[PDB]
Symmetry: D3
Subunit: 241 residues, 6 copies
């Protein structure tokens, strides 16, 4: 292998410069099938790789795992192999009342409630998506005919206290996160998520292009339709080549 974790060489990619990065390894094969010549590359830990083809051009589908740490490994080791554009896809939980289940979220920038982003750029540096990547995801959202929301996403290093959950073992949430959800709602933040801040800060500070699209499956305020998000990310990839 030419890289440490992914178990991949530069030859496997075959000139691929764009990668689609889901979170779950099980969804890697699924996305690859939408494109020409889908082939399994490697599988080590939370990193599953597949190659495909769009308009003759090779593309990578690779999993990140949960959190910025594992994501920082994946982006770096793909960048070592020639990947310059990264398209993030996931499923999230909205914190806004107007955002429904089945709706699509395209992230312009992330609230940096993580630790890994700080390893690439200081806190005052924006976790902003590449504009040409964001443009492609928005145009792809219109074509599929998705109910799309464009804005800011809060990226947390925890699923529980960082997203202000109290149904836990301790029932305790640290001071600075106590009452923070409502503050993000007041600031117009669409959703909680766990990888974007690291991903976006990594790319925006190292000359790489990044963009994120996610499908809403739950809403935390208001107490399976169609997977538009997957079709959007591959459509956007076509225009970014």
């Amino acid at each position: 292998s030419d890289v440490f974790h992914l178990g991949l060489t530069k030859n496997d990619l075959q000139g691929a410069t764009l990668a689609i990065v889901p979170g779950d390894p099980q969804r890697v094969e699924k996305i690859a099938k939408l494109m020409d010549n889908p082939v399994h590359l490697a599988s080590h830990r939370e990193f599953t790789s597949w190659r495909a083809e769009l308009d003759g051009k090779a593309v990578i589908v690779c999993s990140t795992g949960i959190g910025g740490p594992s994501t920082s490994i994946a982006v770096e080791e793909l960048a070592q192999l020639g990947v310059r554009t990264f398209l993030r896809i996931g499923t999230t939980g909205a914190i806004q009342p107007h955002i429904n289940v089945g709706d699509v979220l395209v992230t312009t920038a992330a609230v940096r409630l993580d630790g890994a982003s700080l390893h690439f750029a200081p806190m005052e540096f924006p976790a902003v998506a590449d504009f040409s990547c964001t443009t492609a995801l928005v145009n792809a959202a219109k074509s599929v005919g998705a109910t799309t929301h464009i804005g800011i996403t809060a990226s947390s290093d925890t699923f529980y206290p960082g997203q202000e959950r109290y149904d836990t073992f301790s029932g305790r949430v640290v001071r600075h996160f106590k009452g923070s959800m409502e503050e993000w709602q007041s600031m117009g933040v669409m959703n909680y998520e766990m990888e974007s801040a690291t991903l976006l800060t990594m790319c925006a500070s190292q000359g790489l292009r990044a963009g994120m699209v996610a499908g809403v499956i739950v809403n935390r305020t208001q107490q399976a339709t169609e997977s538009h998000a997957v079709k959007i990310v591959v459509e956007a990839a076509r225009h970014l080549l």
Copy 2:
């Protein structure tokens, strides 16, 4: 009778305008408004000179901010309570990337917060990002004019000298965290220095207000009327 503290304006003076073009210099306010229809001078208090014009029969306000985020925060807030929801920022900048030339136009996606006023609206971890539709109309307007357009991240400083790492000063001294900072921003892909975007974009993005940032390059620091003005007006037509 003014309904706002600093601008010297009331709700009726805007004519139901919901979009503002915000240059830095009060002198430049007159010149932008006259490129549009029915240019009427509204008020001139301190660094806040306001004019009113028309785009395709729709009321548009042009108001200066002055230098820095403190006076910009005053203008944007008092325009926001006067009914303004969209703010398009026009200005001049000094690029730090060697491939950017004098006469090139820069569109800011997001700002590096090297200011203080942005913290008064959102914590540092919150992104100083521009509104997508504002940025898109701003990029599309740049193609029509045919200007050499650079799109990316801007470093927004609270000072002209040490925060931009200028050494030819009275002290010839820069505080330690700003030493070698320009180089660090250069490697991170930051294109330029200015002084107002971090405050503008943060206070708008955290308060449900649309914001866009455009600037024309007049100086390059690697080697130590105009397009941008035409671009901001064209973009303002496609926003409303």
Copy 3:
């Protein structure tokens, strides 16, 4: 012609002047300048309006700063490049203590650093403290004019609204670290809010420049109730003893 980028001033315009009286408003420069000998308009660029005058035979420059630290730091820096070593801040302010009345005078010893520009010259642990000789001259001058004077600390905020804990805004809300902040400032004996002193006093105290501040109270947000012009006469009188 100009030796500096913003002010539009040469070193010849000052004629050897080493002291600057620095208001905020450009429209106050001419008025302060005419209280002294041979007043002349030097330059007017944006928020920076400068006038030269003579005080006891010695040249003095009056120059506006505009609102906020960023603009203040430009004027002070460029004046320091042009030879100015002593800076006297003049303005008008509100108050946050019930015992401070409209018409009183405030001499600032140090500022609470709620700006960002001060960080560009000194770390947060460094004090935003006025020059003793500048402060003393302003205190003596206030006594000579017969003004009711308060000496203490000013909160210097980068915003007019949320940093001064105002709720009548478009959002109607304040960030969590400014919630109840006015209450704890007035609990700490802070006199007032203002928007420039943290930058001025820090950038001077960390660069071998002398700085002082005096302000006229025109309103009190704690009070209700119903001529002075002391502040203007104080800054001029104090300047004579610092020359």
Copy 4:
């Protein structure tokens, strides 16, 4: 089908297990569980693979965490909802001290918090300290196998590369505060770099849970099976 969101486990699956051995890799859990009585696969979801085994007549769960604090915080929290109170960490590590060789054993008393997730449970002032009973058990288990043991502090980073001051990257750039950071940790007596302990030790010590870590040295950047035996032996004394 499950009491928890991510692990795919119910409380009854653990059969009263209050102790958890937590490796990083879901491939390494089956092997650990088979070193004990009655090993049974419970669930495999994402980076979380869980096995139930028996030790001295008492049930024990072995569960992977994945890479990083975020995924570790999910596993530990959800295991604690299932009744786990003791968390023993096993892994393989590098070293930044020249006197520590390949094949040696490291026991972590506390971690340098170069992560983000630890701050979600306790502020930076709060120490990322291991439980005394867990650490004591691990040191005593290290003697019984005759291992070259080092006891001390570990640096725990949210990245594999810049946070561990690696320049062999795509950009070759390391941030200001991590430039020269490895030499700083070396002079302070820090043994090694790692990516999960700051999160693990902080959330446990601040929520009334017991935690300890043992690791095996497989490489040393300053130079040119004991660990698995220790963690199991130490789990016996913690019941």
Copy 5:
């Protein structure tokens, strides 16, 4: 003549490498006069030092004074003269309801609510005790048979606002300490104290060994014989 504050020389120690460190100068005499041939060394400000013998080996009892600043001087100047092991003895007030007056508290690590500890290592670095020092203090506590609690201690730079005391001249507490006591006890902190964070950060970042034991005098939540004998018994097994 070799150190600036303590007024001691290498020869005054007589090859001693262990120091028992109380805060109060008056208790130094009692700790020293519990071992073989106690000799008074020097008294400068709050730095009263004595020399005694334990198992035929020279040992030092030296006062630190109140707080990290004065503690940092004493440790540093002791270290210059050849001291490598420091054992903190003192009296404390518990913040847990299950800890009684007369109980013994052993500190594994400290919450850093001080400034002096930052002068040696950044906040992310853990203020953790040396393991062998903690081991000996724990064993000594069982060897004397005292009600022992092992865990985390909050180390404040102030007696009043840092420990959330409102019965003061101002009658108010700064906003980040407002409600902080409830936070520390929810995170499992045993007690409030004023010296440990500095002591533990100093030693663990310099290659020095440090431990802490304290006897409970008061408990604010509810309605020296042991600790002194423990620190002496523990000092026996460290050389």
Copy 6:
């Protein structure tokens, strides 16, 4: 008896509102005897208190000890007893070439390189001396005919690394204190010291009046009569 640490009743002051605060407990007696009718009050730990009389008015002299933590106790507890004015007399070493041994330093404000000051006010709050106290110390310095310097002082929580001293056991200075002396020097900072930040912050934020005067005995860059005369002379004008 009326207080915890100091051991003084309100009547032990006899209506005293001004306190002269040296660092050394052994200097309290020498300073008090320069005034009328000096009488010992209490000596507990590093807190030695005497009562003297100036112009018929009762004053109190009390030691602070080394550092902010011990100083924070004395100030607040004297404030409980009715003291509203604090004047610090001390000895110091300058970092500025033009300042000579024997010169007198009047501190306008302190650089907060401490921890205790944060317990009373956030970092952005200035550690500024009271103007009437500062003016009195300047006038008294003129009357004695002392070479006086008026400006900013750096108040460190440590004697060694915080003042950038490399002549130490480790020979190491933490990252952010590396090159700090040069930075303070270029910012017109006069000297290093250890108590002013805590003293001035807690007084200016709680309605107490504070000033500081110190005598230069050493200069790093290269008689004792004054300062002590100045602080007593200034105290008279503040009554």
